[PDB]
Amino acid sequence: SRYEHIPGPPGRVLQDVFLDWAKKYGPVVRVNVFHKTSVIVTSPESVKKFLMSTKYNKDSKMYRALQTVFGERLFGQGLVSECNYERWHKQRRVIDLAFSRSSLVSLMETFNEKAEQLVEILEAKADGQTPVSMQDMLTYTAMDILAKAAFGMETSMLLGAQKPLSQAVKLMLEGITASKRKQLREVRESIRFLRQVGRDWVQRRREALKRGEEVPADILTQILKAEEGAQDDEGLLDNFVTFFIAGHETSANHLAFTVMELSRQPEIVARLQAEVDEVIGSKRYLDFEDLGRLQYLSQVLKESLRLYPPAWGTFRLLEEETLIDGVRVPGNTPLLFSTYVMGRMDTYFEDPLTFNPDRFGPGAPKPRFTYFPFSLGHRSCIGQQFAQMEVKVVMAKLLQRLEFRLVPGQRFGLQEQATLKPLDPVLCTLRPRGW
Numbered sequence: 001s002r003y004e005h006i007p008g009p010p011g012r013v014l015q016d017v018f019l020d021w022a023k024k025y026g027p028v029v030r031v032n033v034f035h036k037t038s039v040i041v042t043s044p045e046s047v048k049k050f051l052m053s054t055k056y057n058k059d060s061k062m063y064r065a066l067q068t069v070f071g072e073r074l075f076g077q078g079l080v081s082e083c084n085y086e087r088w089h090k091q092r093r094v095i096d097l098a099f100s101r102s103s104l105v106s107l108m109e110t111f112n113e114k115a116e117q118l119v120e121i122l123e124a125k126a127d128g129q130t131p132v133s134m135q136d137m138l139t140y141t142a143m144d145i146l147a148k149a150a151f152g153m154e155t156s157m158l159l160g161a162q163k164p165l166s167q168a169v170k171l172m173l174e175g176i177t178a179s180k181r182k183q184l185r186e187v188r189e190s191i192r193f194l195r196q197v198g199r200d201w202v203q204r205r206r207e208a209l210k211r212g213e214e215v216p217a218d219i220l221t222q223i224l225k226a227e228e229g230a231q232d233d234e235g236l237l238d239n240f241v242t243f244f245i246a247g248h249e250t251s252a253n254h255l256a257f258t259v260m261e262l263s264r265q266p267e268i269v270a271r272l273q274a275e276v277d278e279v280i281g282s283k284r285y286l287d288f289e290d291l292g293r294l295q296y297l298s299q300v301l302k303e304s305l306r307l308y309p310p311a312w313g314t315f316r317l318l319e320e321e322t323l324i325d326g327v328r329v330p331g332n333t334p335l336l337f338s339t340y341v342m343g344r345m346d347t348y349f350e351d352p353l354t355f356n357p358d359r360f361g362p363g364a365p366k367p368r369f370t371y372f373p374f375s376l377g378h379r380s381c382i383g384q385q386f387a388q389m390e391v392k393v394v395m396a397k398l399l400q401r402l403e404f405r406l407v408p409g410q411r412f413g414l415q416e417q418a419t420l421k422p423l424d425p426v427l428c429t430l431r432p433r434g435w
């Protein structure tokens with residue numbers, strides 16, 4: 001009853017229902033997400049007010065689904081799901097060190113090596129006939145990159161290793177959205193497995209440090225540092241799992257969506273191929289300076305995130321009753337922000353369903369609080385530049401070497417768990433560039 005005065009209803013996903021309702025009912029709409037009543041706020045004024053202030057914190061009730069699943073601790077109080085400001089701020093500032101300019105520049109070798117491995121595997125299949133799941137291949141690449149970059153481990157998913165691990169991730173993500181008997185069993189065991197991987201890799205790191213082996217400072221270094229005097233390792237494992245999942249899942253989804261969309265954009269692909277040819281030539285390795293020169297690719301990736309944001313948005317807690325765009329919203333209410341919804345509204349983007357990289361051209365007016373694929377403010381993505389770099393490296397190497405055609409019958413639709421991803425496996429046939 002407390003929300004009844006708020007406007008609202010009396011490969012298609014929940015975000016699409018939200019889009020319809022925002023269009024029908026306006027900038028402040030009452031909805032149902034993760035069992036609770038929330039209010040979807042879609043004016044840029046609101047985006048600015050709530051996301052760009054340390055006064056507004058994440059809503060713990062909406063993050064409970066990440067913290068624990070079916071009685072199994074998952075992301076716990078890790079960096080994504082911690083909703084206490086002071087607790088978040090402590091760990092954020094420590095982990096920030098792993099995402100310094102110099103830290104990320106040093107990762108270029110890892111990005112290049114995994115991208116090169118992917119391309120060599122695809123080249124051998126490029127007979128214009130063999131169907132290849134680009135969703136799968138890009139997920140394996142993203143995982144291999146993350147495991148090495150963040151934790152100094154070799155998952156070798158591109159070599160067909162760690163199949164149970166990939167199964168565990170899938171079942172766990174299904175688990176988040178779920179919240180019969182067999183599904184519960186599978187989800188719980190998957191979560192415990194991932195945390196055990198954490199214990200294993202943490203023990204390996206500690207052993208290396210004791211034996212005085214060389215350990216390059218990485219994300220794991222800072223995750224350990226953040227827990228320097230904790231009672232137990234549960235906080236450490238929270239962050240292990242957080243970074244293990246967040247560090248590859250969205251990157252993989254972003255790559256897959258981009259490949260999927262580009263399969264129906266031959267002119268844009270031709271332009272991208274030309275840009276890569278001109279900037280890097282036949283070089284096997286992209287330098288950091290090369291990344292900045294791939295300006296058209298940067299625009300295409302931005303436009304991909306407008307239409308296909310893997311991370312659709314965020315929640316903040318409204319503590320006190322507040323007027324939001326002429327609507328009285330009661331205190332203690334989750335506000336839902338969605339870059340997916342706003343990206344597809346004609347009031348914010350002309351011809352919203354058209355894929356046009358020119359929206360992000362140098363001279364074009366920049367979206368003002370209508371586009372936030374990495375979120376905004378203090379709780380924005382710590383991994384934003386990491387992700388931007390790795391995806392540019394992967395995409396550039398694909399464009400350098402291969403032509404992709406989507407297998408007829410493959411859909412452009414979405415599926416939604418916690419994050420958005422292609423409904424279909426992005427099955428493509430491949431040919432080497434140059435006939």
Ligand code: HEM
Nearest residue numbers: 079080246247250251254311314374375379381382383387
């Ligand atoms: C293209 C890929 C990516 C996208 C679109 C993306 C998007 C986002 C979004 C929307 C948030 C806000 C989440 C929320 O409010 O619940 C976020 C936060 C976060 N992301 Fe990412 N992300 C990406 C890649 C990465 C990578 C590569 C890492 C780690 C290596 C990462 C780690 C995180 C973490 C730890 C947070 C929580 C930050 C904080 O609250 O202090 N993400 N990301």
Ligand SMILES: O=C(Nc1cc(C(F)(F)F)cc(-c2cnco2)n1)C1CC1
Nearest residue numbers: 062245246247249250311313314418419
């Ligand atoms: O679910 C939410 N955030 C969320 C969830 C996930 C998950 F579950 F797929 F692991 C991953 C990321 C992420 C952020 N950066 C990279 O991955 N974010 C909030 C409540 C809406």
